[PDB]
Amino acid sequence: MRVITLAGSPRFPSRSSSLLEYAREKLNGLDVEVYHWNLQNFAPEDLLYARFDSPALKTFTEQLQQADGLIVATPVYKAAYSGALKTLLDLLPERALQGKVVLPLATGGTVAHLLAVDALKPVLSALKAQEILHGVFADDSQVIDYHHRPQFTPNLQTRLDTALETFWQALHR
Amino acid sequence: MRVITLAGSPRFPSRSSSLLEYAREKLNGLDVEVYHWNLQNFAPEDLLYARFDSPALKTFTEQLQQADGLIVATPVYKAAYSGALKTLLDLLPERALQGKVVLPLATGGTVAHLLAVDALKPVLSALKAQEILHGVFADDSQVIDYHHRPQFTPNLQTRLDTALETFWQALH
């Protein structure tokens, strides 16, 4: 099995990239091949101006088509997912997530941000995801020194491990 | 009175920009000052990588600060507003629409697209807009020309004029 990870932060490193490095490690340990992407793998002018001839878009799309699941992480901005992430999602084929399991992750610093934990759901449903797991919310305080190795407070670590085990099981269903 | 218009399409010209050009013609006639922006006015690197020193961002935010209202138009992609528009909205200050009236416009080709006519509402609410008008949907099939001067079907023209009159009344 094959999983795409996608960080949707405007910056790298980010809290999103820390969550997804952990996810990649856990999935690799389960013998899952991981295709690891972030927004800095794309040219901004191709994302902002919807250039379907983008080589990174075509490469990502080829790899996504082969993947059984997607783990996607975004900071919460203005009560929703990041526009930066959405620029890439908007350029995917219309049924790009058909037959795939999706685990959404969100990061932010306030209760208002926590209310946006499932803001990607309509977008992922529009992309025809087969199964959309409950979104995991990582408060900014729970991701420790995201510039270096993945490091989480125990509350977040437990929730992330739980979600990743649910995701792994869903890949088999 | 001052109004900002903001086209949220990845391409220019677009159906969105044509709606806003129509609005600009009307507001010109009503002696409302209009500052018109599109996403091609920004450096894409600044929007995608959230670079707040962006000069165009500074000018846009200063013009928005002095504006009484905002007309914002987006194509509908994946059941929501465009990500390209949202990249710019994400860089605005926390209460950037405080005290302002907003008219949201959306374009698309199917009824699924129509269902996202109010998709911007949570974002505009997060920006503390004083009054968010009901969203107006323009079907692609009723935009006859968006490259030259805007040309719309009579029904779309009537509906846009009605919404723009509502917007003008709200400003006053």
mmCIF file of C-alpha atoms in Angstrom:
data_model
loop_
_atom_site.group_PDB
_atom_site.id
_atom_site.type_symbol
_atom_site.label_atom_id
_atom_site.label_comp_id
_atom_site.label_asym_id
_atom_site.label_seq_id
_atom_site.Cartn_x
_atom_site.Cartn_y
_atom_site.Cartn_z
ATOM 1 C CA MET A 1 0.000 0.000 0.000
ATOM 2 C CA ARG A 2 0.828 3.582 -0.762
ATOM 3 C CA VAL A 3 -0.112 6.783 1.051
ATOM 4 C CA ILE A 4 0.350 10.429 0.062
ATOM 5 C CA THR A 5 1.147 12.922 2.788
ATOM 6 C CA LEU A 6 0.519 16.566 2.007
ATOM 7 C CA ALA A 7 1.515 19.559 4.135
ATOM 8 C CA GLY A 8 -0.611 22.617 3.466
ATOM 9 C CA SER A 9 1.391 25.246 5.316
ATOM 10 C CA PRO A 10 2.816 28.333 3.585
ATOM 11 C CA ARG A 11 6.101 27.718 5.424
ATOM 12 C CA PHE A 12 8.466 24.790 5.822
ATOM 13 C CA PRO A 13 9.170 23.542 8.420
ATOM 14 C CA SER A 14 5.764 23.873 10.006
ATOM 15 C CA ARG A 15 3.640 22.200 12.636
ATOM 16 C CA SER A 16 1.963 20.427 9.709
ATOM 17 C CA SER A 17 5.282 19.058 8.457
ATOM 18 C CA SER A 18 6.115 17.770 11.949
ATOM 19 C CA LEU A 19 2.789 15.910 12.191
ATOM 20 C CA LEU A 20 3.332 14.447 8.740
ATOM 21 C CA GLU A 21 6.940 13.391 9.358
ATOM 22 C CA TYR A 22 5.594 11.420 12.324
ATOM 23 C CA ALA A 23 2.876 9.951 10.106
ATOM 24 C CA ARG A 24 5.411 8.947 7.466
ATOM 25 C CA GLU A 25 7.580 7.229 10.078
ATOM 26 C CA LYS A 26 4.619 5.310 11.508
ATOM 27 C CA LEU A 27 3.377 4.226 8.074
ATOM 28 C CA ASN A 28 6.837 3.187 6.894
ATOM 29 C CA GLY A 29 7.096 1.069 10.051
ATOM 30 C CA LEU A 30 3.906 -0.696 8.900
ATOM 31 C CA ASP A 31 5.513 -1.367 5.494
ATOM 32 C CA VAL A 32 3.514 1.381 3.739
ATOM 33 C CA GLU A 33 5.208 3.340 0.958
ATOM 34 C CA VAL A 34 4.800 7.100 1.543
ATOM 35 C CA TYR A 35 4.871 9.839 -1.113
ATOM 36 C CA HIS A 36 5.735 12.934 0.950
ATOM 37 C CA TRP A 37 4.692 16.327 -0.443
ATOM 38 C CA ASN A 38 4.486 19.909 0.729
ATOM 39 C CA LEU A 39 3.411 23.152 -0.869
ATOM 40 C CA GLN A 40 7.039 24.190 -1.435
ATOM 41 C CA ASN A 41 7.262 21.313 -3.962
ATOM 42 C CA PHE A 42 5.089 23.424 -6.332
ATOM 43 C CA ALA A 43 5.763 26.683 -8.081
ATOM 44 C CA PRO A 44 3.545 29.371 -6.495
ATOM 45 C CA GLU A 45 2.749 30.942 -9.826
ATOM 46 C CA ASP A 46 1.406 27.604 -11.041
ATOM 47 C CA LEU A 47 -0.813 27.216 -7.976
ATOM 48 C CA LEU A 48 -2.115 30.791 -7.816
ATOM 49 C CA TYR A 49 -2.840 31.008 -11.569
ATOM 50 C CA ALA A 50 -4.078 27.415 -12.097
ATOM 51 C CA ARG A 51 -1.426 26.214 -14.528
ATOM 52 C CA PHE A 52 -2.389 22.635 -15.329
ATOM 53 C CA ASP A 53 0.863 22.216 -17.245
ATOM 54 C CA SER A 54 2.784 22.371 -13.938
ATOM 55 C CA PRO A 55 5.233 19.448 -13.772
ATOM 56 C CA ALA A 56 4.874 19.230 -10.005
ATOM 57 C CA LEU A 57 1.078 19.100 -10.307
ATOM 58 C CA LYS A 58 1.282 16.355 -12.927
ATOM 59 C CA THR A 59 3.754 14.399 -10.800
ATOM 60 C CA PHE A 60 1.685 14.791 -7.636
ATOM 61 C CA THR A 61 -1.463 13.783 -9.516
ATOM 62 C CA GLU A 62 0.206 10.638 -10.911
ATOM 63 C CA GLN A 63 1.345 9.639 -7.405
ATOM 64 C CA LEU A 64 -2.033 10.416 -5.819
ATOM 65 C CA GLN A 65 -3.751 8.231 -8.415
ATOM 66 C CA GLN A 66 -1.598 5.291 -7.236
ATOM 67 C CA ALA A 67 -2.196 5.983 -3.530
ATOM 68 C CA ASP A 68 -4.652 4.176 -1.295
ATOM 69 C CA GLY A 69 -4.924 7.060 1.156
ATOM 70 C CA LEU A 70 -4.113 10.684 1.867
ATOM 71 C CA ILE A 71 -3.007 12.331 5.107
ATOM 72 C CA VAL A 72 -3.391 16.087 4.711
ATOM 73 C CA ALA A 73 -2.417 18.729 7.270
ATOM 74 C CA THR A 74 -3.151 22.446 7.309
ATOM 75 C CA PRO A 75 -2.914 25.429 9.623
ATOM 76 C CA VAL A 76 -6.270 27.048 10.310
ATOM 77 C CA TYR A 77 -6.551 30.570 8.875
ATOM 78 C CA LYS A 78 -9.689 32.737 8.949
ATOM 79 C CA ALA A 79 -11.802 29.856 10.283
ATOM 80 C CA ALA A 80 -10.884 27.441 7.487
ATOM 81 C CA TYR A 81 -8.118 25.456 5.857
ATOM 82 C CA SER A 82 -5.302 27.473 4.312
ATOM 83 C CA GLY A 83 -5.850 29.073 0.974
ATOM 84 C CA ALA A 84 -2.399 27.820 0.053
ATOM 85 C CA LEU A 85 -3.533 24.192 0.451
ATOM 86 C CA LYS A 86 -6.802 24.878 -1.343
ATOM 87 C CA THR A 87 -4.963 26.250 -4.416
ATOM 88 C CA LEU A 88 -3.500 22.772 -4.950
ATOM 89 C CA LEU A 89 -6.715 20.903 -4.159
ATOM 90 C CA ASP A 90 -8.515 23.065 -6.738
ATOM 91 C CA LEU A 91 -6.221 21.783 -9.520
ATOM 92 C CA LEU A 92 -6.792 18.081 -8.843
ATOM 93 C CA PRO A 93 -9.073 16.020 -11.108
ATOM 94 C CA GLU A 94 -12.700 16.214 -10.104
ATOM 95 C CA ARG A 95 -12.897 12.716 -8.588
ATOM 96 C CA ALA A 96 -9.278 12.586 -7.467
ATOM 97 C CA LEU A 97 -9.961 10.992 -4.060
ATOM 98 C CA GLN A 98 -12.423 8.381 -5.287
ATOM 99 C CA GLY A 99 -11.787 5.101 -3.479
ATOM 100 C CA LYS A 100 -9.298 6.677 -1.049
ATOM 101 C CA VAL A 101 -9.193 7.101 2.722
ATOM 102 C CA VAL A 102 -8.367 10.599 3.998
ATOM 103 C CA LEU A 103 -7.065 11.630 7.424
ATOM 104 C CA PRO A 104 -7.258 15.418 7.898
ATOM 105 C CA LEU A 105 -5.099 17.196 10.439
ATOM 106 C CA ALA A 106 -5.325 20.828 11.481
ATOM 107 C CA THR A 107 -3.133 23.125 13.548
ATOM 108 C CA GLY A 108 -3.923 26.363 15.316
ATOM 109 C CA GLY A 109 -3.761 28.303 18.512
ATOM 110 C CA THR A 110 -7.284 29.194 19.609
ATOM 111 C CA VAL A 111 -10.649 27.607 20.263
ATOM 112 C CA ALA A 112 -11.906 29.404 17.170
ATOM 113 C CA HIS A 113 -9.275 27.458 15.226
ATOM 114 C CA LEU A 114 -10.389 24.227 16.927
ATOM 115 C CA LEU A 115 -13.878 24.820 15.536
ATOM 116 C CA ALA A 116 -12.371 24.566 12.022
ATOM 117 C CA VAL A 117 -10.925 21.086 12.575
ATOM 118 C CA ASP A 118 -13.273 19.588 9.959
ATOM 119 C CA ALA A 119 -13.304 22.518 7.526
ATOM 120 C CA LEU A 120 -11.744 20.404 4.742
ATOM 121 C CA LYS A 121 -14.661 17.939 4.791
ATOM 122 C CA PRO A 122 -16.811 19.569 2.017
ATOM 123 C CA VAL A 123 -13.738 19.890 -0.188
ATOM 124 C CA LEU A 124 -12.667 16.286 0.367
ATOM 125 C CA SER A 125 -16.261 15.182 -0.240
ATOM 126 C CA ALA A 126 -16.302 17.169 -3.487
ATOM 127 C CA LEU A 127 -13.168 15.214 -4.477
ATOM 128 C CA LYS A 128 -15.156 11.982 -3.813
ATOM 129 C CA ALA A 129 -13.134 10.632 -0.877
ATOM 130 C CA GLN A 130 -14.397 7.169 0.051
ATOM 131 C CA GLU A 131 -13.875 7.693 3.776
ATOM 132 C CA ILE A 132 -13.025 10.906 5.629
ATOM 133 C CA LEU A 133 -11.769 10.308 9.167
ATOM 134 C CA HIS A 134 -12.516 12.681 12.030
ATOM 135 C CA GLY A 135 -10.110 15.594 11.834
ATOM 136 C CA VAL A 136 -7.337 15.687 14.461
ATOM 137 C CA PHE A 137 -6.632 19.150 15.861
ATOM 138 C CA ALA A 138 -3.146 19.952 17.113
ATOM 139 C CA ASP A 139 -3.055 23.079 19.220
ATOM 140 C CA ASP A 140 0.095 25.082 18.576
ATOM 141 C CA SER A 141 1.223 24.364 22.163
ATOM 142 C CA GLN A 142 1.073 20.619 21.595
ATOM 143 C CA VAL A 143 3.669 20.500 18.781
ATOM 144 C CA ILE A 144 7.106 21.024 20.316
ATOM 145 C CA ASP A 145 10.025 22.450 18.298
ATOM 146 C CA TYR A 146 8.614 21.650 14.889
ATOM 147 C CA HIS A 147 11.890 22.675 13.267
ATOM 148 C CA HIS A 148 13.481 19.422 14.426
ATOM 149 C CA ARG A 149 12.192 15.872 15.071
ATOM 150 C CA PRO A 150 8.442 15.303 15.587
ATOM 151 C CA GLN A 151 7.704 15.988 19.225
ATOM 152 C CA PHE A 152 4.228 16.214 20.732
ATOM 153 C CA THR A 153 2.655 16.549 24.123
ATOM 154 C CA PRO A 154 1.298 13.220 25.347
ATOM 155 C CA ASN A 155 -2.324 14.217 24.778
ATOM 156 C CA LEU A 156 -1.661 14.937 21.134
ATOM 157 C CA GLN A 157 0.632 11.952 20.679
ATOM 158 C CA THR A 158 -2.135 9.626 21.911
ATOM 159 C CA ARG A 159 -4.728 11.168 19.609
ATOM 160 C CA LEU A 160 -2.397 11.107 16.615
ATOM 161 C CA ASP A 161 -1.477 7.439 17.198
ATOM 162 C CA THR A 162 -5.171 6.583 17.542
ATOM 163 C CA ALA A 163 -6.035 8.343 14.288
ATOM 164 C CA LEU A 164 -3.116 6.751 12.442
ATOM 165 C CA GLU A 165 -4.180 3.271 13.590
ATOM 166 C CA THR A 166 -7.752 3.979 12.461
ATOM 167 C CA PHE A 167 -6.381 5.194 9.124
ATOM 168 C CA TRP A 168 -4.240 2.079 8.717
ATOM 169 C CA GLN A 169 -7.236 -0.142 9.433
ATOM 170 C CA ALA A 170 -9.422 1.830 7.005
ATOM 171 C CA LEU A 171 -6.879 1.259 4.258
ATOM 172 C CA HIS A 172 -7.796 -2.434 4.622
ATOM 173 C CA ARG A 173 -11.564 -1.912 4.376
ATOM 174 C CA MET B 1 -18.082 56.465 -0.367
ATOM 175 C CA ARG B 2 -15.227 54.093 -1.259
ATOM 176 C CA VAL B 3 -15.543 50.486 -2.466
ATOM 177 C CA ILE B 4 -12.906 47.833 -3.129
ATOM 178 C CA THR B 5 -13.575 45.241 -5.810
ATOM 179 C CA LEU B 6 -11.559 42.017 -5.651
ATOM 180 C CA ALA B 7 -11.482 39.363 -8.349
ATOM 181 C CA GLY B 8 -10.590 35.939 -6.937
ATOM 182 C CA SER B 9 -10.065 33.960 -10.109
ATOM 183 C CA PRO B 10 -6.717 32.348 -10.941
ATOM 184 C CA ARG B 11 -7.080 33.689 -14.490
ATOM 185 C CA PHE B 12 -7.518 37.198 -15.875
ATOM 186 C CA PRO B 13 -9.825 38.057 -17.505
ATOM 187 C CA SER B 14 -12.422 35.863 -15.835
ATOM 188 C CA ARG B 15 -16.144 35.675 -15.346
ATOM 189 C CA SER B 16 -15.482 37.102 -11.862
ATOM 190 C CA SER B 17 -13.572 40.096 -13.205
ATOM 191 C CA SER B 18 -16.395 40.746 -15.684
ATOM 192 C CA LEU B 19 -18.998 40.858 -12.902
ATOM 193 C CA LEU B 20 -16.820 43.363 -11.059
ATOM 194 C CA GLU B 21 -16.272 45.503 -14.167
ATOM 195 C CA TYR B 22 -20.057 45.718 -14.517
ATOM 196 C CA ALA B 23 -20.223 46.758 -10.868
ATOM 197 C CA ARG B 24 -17.520 49.377 -11.470
ATOM 198 C CA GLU B 25 -19.504 50.915 -14.340
ATOM 199 C CA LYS B 26 -22.518 51.294 -12.030
ATOM 200 C CA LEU B 27 -20.513 52.660 -9.100
ATOM 201 C CA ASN B 28 -18.711 55.105 -11.402
ATOM 202 C CA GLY B 29 -22.128 56.447 -12.318
ATOM 203 C CA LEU B 30 -23.129 56.792 -8.646
ATOM 204 C CA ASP B 31 -19.938 58.750 -7.785
ATOM 205 C CA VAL B 32 -18.557 55.980 -5.562
ATOM 206 C CA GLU B 33 -14.758 55.769 -5.562
ATOM 207 C CA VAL B 34 -13.646 52.297 -6.662
ATOM 208 C CA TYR B 35 -10.294 50.579 -6.188
ATOM 209 C CA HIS B 36 -10.125 47.406 -8.261
ATOM 210 C CA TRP B 37 -7.825 44.474 -7.543
ATOM 211 C CA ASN B 38 -7.259 41.028 -8.922
ATOM 212 C CA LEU B 39 -4.917 38.210 -7.964
ATOM 213 C CA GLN B 40 -2.619 39.035 -10.884
ATOM 214 C CA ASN B 41 -1.794 42.262 -9.009
ATOM 215 C CA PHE B 42 0.150 40.312 -6.349
ATOM 216 C CA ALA B 43 3.359 38.330 -6.461
ATOM 217 C CA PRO B 44 2.290 34.672 -6.200
ATOM 218 C CA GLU B 45 5.262 33.857 -3.966
ATOM 219 C CA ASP B 46 4.065 36.373 -1.415
ATOM 220 C CA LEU B 47 0.556 34.875 -1.326
ATOM 221 C CA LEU B 48 1.523 31.200 -1.299
ATOM 222 C CA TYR B 49 4.357 31.599 1.230
ATOM 223 C CA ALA B 50 2.561 34.234 3.371
ATOM 224 C CA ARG B 51 5.074 37.074 2.973
ATOM 225 C CA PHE B 52 3.551 40.023 4.845
ATOM 226 C CA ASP B 53 6.146 42.532 3.608
ATOM 227 C CA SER B 54 4.500 42.243 0.199
ATOM 228 C CA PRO B 55 4.226 45.795 -1.224
ATOM 229 C CA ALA B 56 1.002 45.073 -3.103
ATOM 230 C CA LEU B 57 -0.434 43.612 0.100
ATOM 231 C CA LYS B 58 0.452 46.791 1.956
ATOM 232 C CA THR B 59 -1.274 48.967 -0.658
ATOM 233 C CA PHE B 60 -4.325 46.719 -0.800
ATOM 234 C CA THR B 61 -4.689 46.665 2.986
ATOM 235 C CA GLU B 62 -4.370 50.465 3.169
ATOM 236 C CA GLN B 63 -7.018 50.910 0.465
ATOM 237 C CA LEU B 64 -9.288 48.367 2.163
ATOM 238 C CA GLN B 65 -8.849 50.200 5.472
ATOM 239 C CA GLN B 66 -10.406 53.337 3.976
ATOM 240 C CA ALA B 67 -13.175 51.467 2.154
ATOM 241 C CA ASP B 68 -16.795 51.370 3.162
ATOM 242 C CA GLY B 69 -17.536 48.206 1.225
ATOM 243 C CA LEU B 70 -16.065 45.228 -0.577
ATOM 244 C CA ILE B 71 -17.407 43.385 -3.611
ATOM 245 C CA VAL B 72 -15.579 40.077 -3.949
ATOM 246 C CA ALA B 73 -16.061 37.567 -6.759
ATOM 247 C CA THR B 74 -14.753 34.010 -6.992
ATOM 248 C CA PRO B 75 -15.229 30.956 -9.159
ATOM 249 C CA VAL B 76 -16.487 27.960 -7.228
ATOM 250 C CA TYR B 77 -13.909 25.167 -7.011
ATOM 251 C CA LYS B 78 -14.375 21.930 -5.059
ATOM 252 C CA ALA B 79 -17.557 23.145 -3.351
ATOM 253 C CA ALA B 80 -16.018 26.385 -2.058
ATOM 254 C CA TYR B 81 -14.376 29.702 -2.917
ATOM 255 C CA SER B 82 -11.088 29.527 -4.803
ATOM 256 C CA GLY B 83 -7.963 28.747 -2.862
ATOM 257 C CA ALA B 84 -6.273 31.527 -4.803
ATOM 258 C CA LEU B 85 -8.648 34.109 -3.305
ATOM 259 C CA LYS B 86 -8.308 32.569 0.138
ATOM 260 C CA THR B 87 -4.494 32.970 0.030
ATOM 261 C CA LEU B 88 -4.990 36.737 -0.067
ATOM 262 C CA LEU B 89 -7.747 36.794 2.555
ATOM 263 C CA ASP B 90 -5.501 34.786 4.882
ATOM 264 C CA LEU B 91 -2.925 37.629 4.900
ATOM 265 C CA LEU B 92 -5.352 40.352 5.909
ATOM 266 C CA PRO B 93 -5.393 41.733 9.455
ATOM 267 C CA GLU B 94 -7.573 40.093 12.055
ATOM 268 C CA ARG B 95 -10.591 42.417 11.818
ATOM 269 C CA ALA B 96 -9.938 43.773 8.341
ATOM 270 C CA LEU B 97 -13.635 43.968 7.391
ATOM 271 C CA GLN B 98 -14.852 45.507 10.659
ATOM 272 C CA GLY B 99 -17.478 48.125 9.887
ATOM 273 C CA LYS B 100 -17.757 47.224 6.190
ATOM 274 C CA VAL B 101 -20.485 45.877 3.924
ATOM 275 C CA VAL B 102 -19.531 42.917 1.694
ATOM 276 C CA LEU B 103 -21.272 41.674 -1.465
ATOM 277 C CA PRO B 104 -20.029 38.146 -2.387
ATOM 278 C CA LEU B 105 -20.358 36.918 -5.965
ATOM 279 C CA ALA B 106 -19.707 33.376 -7.186
ATOM 280 C CA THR B 107 -19.420 31.862 -10.664
ATOM 281 C CA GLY B 108 -19.834 28.288 -11.821
ATOM 282 C CA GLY B 109 -21.427 25.935 -14.272
ATOM 283 C CA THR B 110 -23.636 23.520 -12.322
ATOM 284 C CA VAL B 111 -26.049 23.373 -9.404
ATOM 285 C CA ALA B 112 -23.319 21.861 -7.256
ATOM 286 C CA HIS B 113 -21.543 25.183 -7.775
ATOM 287 C CA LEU B 114 -24.678 27.095 -6.775
ATOM 288 C CA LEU B 115 -24.648 25.331 -3.397
ATOM 289 C CA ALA B 116 -21.392 27.158 -2.517
ATOM 290 C CA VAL B 117 -22.819 30.636 -3.150
ATOM 291 C CA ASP B 118 -22.324 31.484 0.557
ATOM 292 C CA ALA B 119 -19.061 29.587 1.015
ATOM 293 C CA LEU B 120 -17.184 32.786 1.840
ATOM 294 C CA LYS B 121 -19.478 33.646 4.760
ATOM 295 C CA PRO B 122 -17.378 31.974 7.540
ATOM 296 C CA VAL B 123 -14.248 33.676 6.208
ATOM 297 C CA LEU B 124 -15.899 37.092 5.928
ATOM 298 C CA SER B 125 -17.345 36.556 9.418
ATOM 299 C CA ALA B 126 -13.887 35.677 10.736
ATOM 300 C CA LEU B 127 -12.738 39.025 9.236
ATOM 301 C CA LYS B 128 -15.558 40.729 11.224
ATOM 302 C CA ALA B 129 -17.536 42.110 8.288
ATOM 303 C CA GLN B 130 -20.333 44.332 9.593
ATOM 304 C CA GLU B 131 -22.874 43.230 6.977
ATOM 305 C CA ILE B 132 -22.501 40.241 4.654
ATOM 306 C CA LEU B 133 -25.063 40.322 1.868
ATOM 307 C CA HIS B 134 -26.587 37.164 0.492
ATOM 308 C CA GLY B 135 -24.335 35.584 -2.098
ATOM 309 C CA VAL B 136 -25.118 36.024 -5.781
ATOM 310 C CA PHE B 137 -24.470 33.155 -8.202
ATOM 311 C CA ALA B 138 -23.691 33.772 -11.878
ATOM 312 C CA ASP B 139 -23.929 30.719 -14.113
ATOM 313 C CA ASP B 140 -21.205 30.561 -16.770
ATOM 314 C CA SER B 141 -23.888 30.044 -19.429
ATOM 315 C CA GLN B 142 -25.255 33.557 -18.854
ATOM 316 C CA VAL B 143 -21.940 35.354 -19.240
ATOM 317 C CA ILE B 144 -21.834 36.089 -22.964
ATOM 318 C CA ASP B 145 -18.529 38.001 -22.929
ATOM 319 C CA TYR B 146 -15.993 38.304 -20.114
ATOM 320 C CA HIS B 147 -12.969 39.217 -22.255
ATOM 321 C CA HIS B 148 -14.137 42.546 -23.649
ATOM 322 C CA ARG B 149 -16.690 44.785 -21.949
ATOM 323 C CA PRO B 150 -18.981 42.583 -19.821
ATOM 324 C CA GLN B 151 -22.021 41.213 -21.642
ATOM 325 C CA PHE B 152 -24.577 39.129 -19.699
ATOM 326 C CA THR B 153 -27.983 37.645 -20.398
ATOM 327 C CA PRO B 154 -30.861 39.946 -19.442
ATOM 328 C CA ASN B 155 -31.750 37.790 -16.450
ATOM 329 C CA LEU B 156 -28.214 37.892 -15.057
ATOM 330 C CA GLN B 157 -27.956 41.626 -15.742
ATOM 331 C CA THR B 158 -31.201 42.196 -13.834
ATOM 332 C CA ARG B 159 -30.077 40.070 -10.913
ATOM 333 C CA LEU B 160 -26.648 41.763 -10.683
ATOM 334 C CA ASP B 161 -28.213 45.229 -10.856
ATOM 335 C CA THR B 162 -30.657 44.258 -8.094
ATOM 336 C CA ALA B 163 -27.848 43.012 -5.842
ATOM 337 C CA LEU B 164 -25.708 46.078 -6.550
ATOM 338 C CA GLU B 165 -28.624 48.336 -5.665
ATOM 339 C CA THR B 166 -29.004 46.400 -2.388
ATOM 340 C CA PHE B 167 -25.264 46.894 -1.764
ATOM 341 C CA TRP B 168 -25.481 50.631 -2.441
ATOM 342 C CA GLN B 169 -28.460 50.992 -0.089
ATOM 343 C CA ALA B 170 -26.543 49.118 2.621
ATOM 344 C CA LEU B 171 -23.572 51.471 2.269
ATOM 345 C CA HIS B 172 -26.033 54.299 2.979
#
